[PDB]
Write a protein that binds this ligand. Structure first.
Ligand SMILES: Nc1ncnc2c1ncn2[C@@H]1O[C@H](COP(=O)(O)OP(=O)(O)OP(=O)(O)O)[C@@H](O)[C@H]1O
Ligand SMILES: [Mg+2]
Ligand SMILES: [Zn+2]
Lengths: 655, 300
């Protein structure tokens, strides 16, 4: 029998006889034993239910024509601890053997899968040990490491040689195939055919390429100790991993921490220092994977809930329950969060579907906190403060690509929040130029850029919620909204709902507010399975202040914005036409901004959003009347007291 | 398969009556099963969606072997058949089924009492539009017919998916009812041939397979422009490609006599003038009374 074909046992693998782990693994017999054990683990692992997890995983992999078989580290550790230890200590060779074994297992289910893909990479999902960019040292070199950070850079996708074939210049001989390491280029200092130290060249037009990308991972600002510099590394993404993350994301990277010789670093620092980079093996975003994601089972729950007669009232009440009053704020912000249905007419007329809300009132009124809440609730939201913002950071910024050395263009705050919400706090404090930068996004729904010969137009379709305090520090109820705030008439017109907040004094209202605030403070004291018990008590409190759990609402918003697009089938136009005519009739009074058709458009937008609450594709009458109420109240409150009396008298049916 | 030689292989397996009936592609699980089948057969997904002419020639040559090897598992062993193929020099081949489909598509979608006359005369003109295409000097008409057939099949598949998902097919001991009252493609469902295409599509899926009893199906479609239902009485079908003594005996269609008797008893201005008695036109206000009378008739 061939000695090279003999295979050891499982226990013998633990007993290592070699200088290093890599030498032990590379031995033929140990390699065959490892391959056999990995195949057995893949083909015989079962969960609590007894289902073969990896059989189904491989079937799904084949279904999508994917070249990645995600493998759980915990399962490997539980099944064969020694193999997990070897994979942790020596990732490269273990991963190579695992890739071969996985390609055999996949071919077991799909015999001809080799035609679609020839290599199936194996990715480790949950590494128990998590590191940070600060604690990485020399001892971690050439081992699997899991780190957390935020992406702050990215380069384009390029093809990189996977197998090279050189040639000589003195004799012209052609060298054999090689493997191109992602970090260092192949170097040859002596031939084999002519056996001379002469120059060389790259030849063999027949080659197989692979995708290649590089990103810069930086430590999360929160994780950094007080006022210390963040630490950054460079991550290399090979085929099947490119374009898996974009700047401004929080990710977890599991890969091999490698190092290589760099002449520039040695020349600069003056000591023999080596450059280091992480060769990515798997990238994940940072319960589960995503709260916004829902399942078929959950979709049935939403339909049941929508059947509730007063679901809209529950949604409004369940929004910012920790805040006692300001029901008009809650209605407006919920309508903005749900959004409208953008409309196009033969490519000639475009109607925006976003809803903009401007918050204005006295200093202490729970304004910024509501914006902070909707930041969490909204799917894609960006929070910017008036003082800490600029047009360059609101439209785009230009960078230089380290690879192609050609200027690219970054994304701005508005761009990052497309199909989402753009929250602005301390809006009145922004400078004129920055406040002009937002005019375009408010109505044109697009931002135009001209820098470094990169003239282009970017897509920015996002709703804007702005909070500000009146000029002079307080809202004089006598004067109109024009003098109260320094914003110009155009921007003021562009806003749909204007929920003016007023802080008066009343004994009963103040008693109720004090009771609610004190109860909220006492309820949230830090002192007031174990994880399941904690979840249960948290749910008790959440239901205490919210008729609907927050977790359900977060998925509800996404589902409604995704799958439901209500449309106006038929409804008595004359009602809203009459309201519009009366608005114009009563708005001629001096000091009241004319009621332009922009209010009529907003009425329809709010009606569509309200119908979206019920998940009903028919905009009924009730929703339209409620939208009329919202718009009429918003307009009435903004006017002066003297005109307010007459406006309130005239409008009774609508309000 | 549907226009194998004039579309992509994936589309050929997708817009097919028999394939969908066997795999029930109208739900996501069916699409997953089709993807798994394609992956097992070894044909990539990108390659499978490439047009037939530009698709890699190796798979085109080995297709028969691949189908023989990997179709028993998924139950589509009746897909293989012998058919006539006619090809003129240097021009792509075309099978009899594809030619017939193109001709029918040209007949269907090619191009008070006044509207009825205009519709019938448009159909008469489409007859001649199809007549010319039957020659070798009018290949352009054939290509247009193939494109129109693709569009019509896509629309019918969408409508059938909607109907099956929303479960509009009510069941009765004697017959089954499917009444359409809304949709974006309701305009097309005025030509009897298109309505019969939809009826055949529905008959194959879950009405002839999936362990379901065989009952005549009454399918109707509204047209607000004239306020009437193009009611069609379809006959059931035994599972395709299942030779048996019962399969030999034809399934007679009894709709004609019951329809005539019901029309005679009542007065709803039923337009019994089509050569095929299975199709009539009933006023909108008199549909449900007629359906009740048909239920009480007990003659199907
Ligand atoms: N109705 C209310 N219910 C509960 N807490 C409230 C209410 N109104 C105000 N508060 C509290 O008032 C405090 C005010 O701070 P907040 O961040 O809400 O805004 P602010 O700083 O007053 O706003 P502005 O930007 O207008 O100056 C918060 O602690 C909020 O909890
Ligand atoms: Mg504030
Ligand atoms: Zn040489």
């Amino acid at each position: 029998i061939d000695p090279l074909r003999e295979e050891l046992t499982l226990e013998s693998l633990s007993n290592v006889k070699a200088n290093s782990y890599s030498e032990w693994i590379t031995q033929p017999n140990v390699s065959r034993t490892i391959a056999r054990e990995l195949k057995s683990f893949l083909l015989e692992y079962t969960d609590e239910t007894g289902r073969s997890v990896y059989g189904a995983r491989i079937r799904t992999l084949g279904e999508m024509n994917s070249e990645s078989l995600e493998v759980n580290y915990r399962h490997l550790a539980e099944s064969k601890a020694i193999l997990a230890l070897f994979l942790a200590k020596c990732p490269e060779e273990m991963l190579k053997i695992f890739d071969l074994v996985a390609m055999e297992a996949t071919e077991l289910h799909y015999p001809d899968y080799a035609r679609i893909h020839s290599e199936i990479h194996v990715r480790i999902s949950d590494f128990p040990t998590i590191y940070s960019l600060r604690e990485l040292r020399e001892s971690n070199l050439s081992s699997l490491v899991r780190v957390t950070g935020v992406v702050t850079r990215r380069t384009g996708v390029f093809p990189q040689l996977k197998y090279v074939k050189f040639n000589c210049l003195k004799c012209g001989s052609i060298l054999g195939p090689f493997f191109q390491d992602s970090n260092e280029e192949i170097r040859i200092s002596f031939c084999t055919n002519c056996k001379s130290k002469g120059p060389f060249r790259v030849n063999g037009e027949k080659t197989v390429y692979r995708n290649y990308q590089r990103v810069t991972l930086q430590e999360a600002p929160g994780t950094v100790p007080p006022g210390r510099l963040p630490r950054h590394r460079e991550v290399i993404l090979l085929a099947d991993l490119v374009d898996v993350s974009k700047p401004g994301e929080e990710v977890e990277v599991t890969g091999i921490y490698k190092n290589n010789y760099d002449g520039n670093l040695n020349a600069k620092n003056g000591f023999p220092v080596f450059a280091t980079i992480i060769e990515a093996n798997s990238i994940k975003r940072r319960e589960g994977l995503d709260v916004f994601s829902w399942t078929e089972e959950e979709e049935r729950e939403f339909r049941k809930i929508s059947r509730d007669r007063g679901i809209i009232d529950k949604i409004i009440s369940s929004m910012a329950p920790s805040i006692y009053g300001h029901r008009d704020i809650k209605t407006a912000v919920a309508c903005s969060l749900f959004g409208g249905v953008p409309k196009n007419v033969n490519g000639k007329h475009s109607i925006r579907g976003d809803i903009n809300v401007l918050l204005l009132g006295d200093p202490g009124t729970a304004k910024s906190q509501i914006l902070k809440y909707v930041e969490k609730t909204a799917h894609r939201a960006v929070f910017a403060t008036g003082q800490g913002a600029s047009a360059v950071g609101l439209t785009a910024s230009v960078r230089k690509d380290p690879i192609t050395k050609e200027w690219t263009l970054e994304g701005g705050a508005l761009v990052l929040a497309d199909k989402g919400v753009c929250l602005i706090d301390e809006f009145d404090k922004m400078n004129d130029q920055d406040r002009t930068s937002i005019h375009e996004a408010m109505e044109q729904q697009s931002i135009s850029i001209s820098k470094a010969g990169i003239v282009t137009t970017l897509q920015a379709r996002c709703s804007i919620i702005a909070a500000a305090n009146p000029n002079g520090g307080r809202y004089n109820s006598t004067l109109p909204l024009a003098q109260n705030v320094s914003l110009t008439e155009p921007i003021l017109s562009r806003f749909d709902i204007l929920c003016v907040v007023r802080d008066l004094v009343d004994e009963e209202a103040d008693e109720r507010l004090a009771t609610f605030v004190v109860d909220s403070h006492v309820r949230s004291h830090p002192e007031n399975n174990a994880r399941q018990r904690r979840l249960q008590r948290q749910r008790k409190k959440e239901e205490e202040i919210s008729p609907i759990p927050q977790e359900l609402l977060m998925k509800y918003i996404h589902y409604a914005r995704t799958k439901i697009y209500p449309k106006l089938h038929q409804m008595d136009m004359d009602k809203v036409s009459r309201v519009y005519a009366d608005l114009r009739r009563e708005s001629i009074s001096t000091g009241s901004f004319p009621i332009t058709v922009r209010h009529l458009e907003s009425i329809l937008r709010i009606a569509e959003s309200f119908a979206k609450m019920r998940l009903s594709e028919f905009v009924s009458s009730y929703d339209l009347d409620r939208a009329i109420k919202v718009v009429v109240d918003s307009f009435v409150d903004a006017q002066k007291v003297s005109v307010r009396r007459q406006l309130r008298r005239s409008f009774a049916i609508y309000t | 398969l549907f226009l194998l030689r004039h579309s992509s292989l994936y589309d050929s397996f997708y817009y097919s009556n028999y394939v969908n009936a066997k795999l029930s592609l109208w739900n996501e699980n069916g699409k997953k099963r089709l993807h798994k089948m394609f992956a097992r057969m070894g044909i990539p997904l990108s390659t499978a969606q490439e047009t037939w002419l530009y698709m890699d020639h190796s798979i085109k040559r080995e297709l028969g072997i691949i189908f023989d090897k990997n179709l028993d598992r998924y139950g589509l062993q009746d897909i293989i058949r012998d058919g006539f193929v006619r090809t003129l020099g240097y021009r792509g081949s075309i099978s009899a089924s594809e030619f017939v489909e193109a001709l029918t598509a040209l007949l269907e979608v090619g191009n008070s009492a006044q509207k009825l006359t205009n519709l019938r005369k448009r159909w008469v003109s489409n007859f001649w539009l199809s007549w010319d295409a039957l020659d070798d000097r009018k290949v352009e008409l054939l290509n247009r017919g193939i494109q129109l057939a693709q569009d019509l099949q896509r629309a019918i598949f969408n409508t059938g998916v909607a109907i099956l998902e929303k479960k509009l097919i009510k069941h009765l001991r004697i017959y089954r009812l499917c009444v359409l009252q809304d949709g974006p493609d309701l305009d097309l469902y005025r030509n009897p041939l298109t309505l019969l295409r939809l009826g055949n599509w529905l008959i194959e899926c879950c009405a002839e397979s999936e362990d379901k009893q065989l009952l005549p199906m009454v399918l109707a479609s509204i047209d607000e422009n004239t306020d009437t239902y193009l009611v069609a009485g379809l006959t059931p079908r035994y599972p395709r490609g299942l030779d048996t003594i019962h399969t030999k005996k034809p399934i007679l269609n009894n709709f004609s006599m019951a329809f005539q008797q019901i029309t005679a008893e009542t007065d709803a201005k039923v337009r019994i003038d089509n050569f095929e008695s299975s199709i009539i036109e009933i006023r909108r206000e008199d549909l449900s009374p007629f359906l009740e009378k048909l239920t009480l008739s007990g003659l199907l």
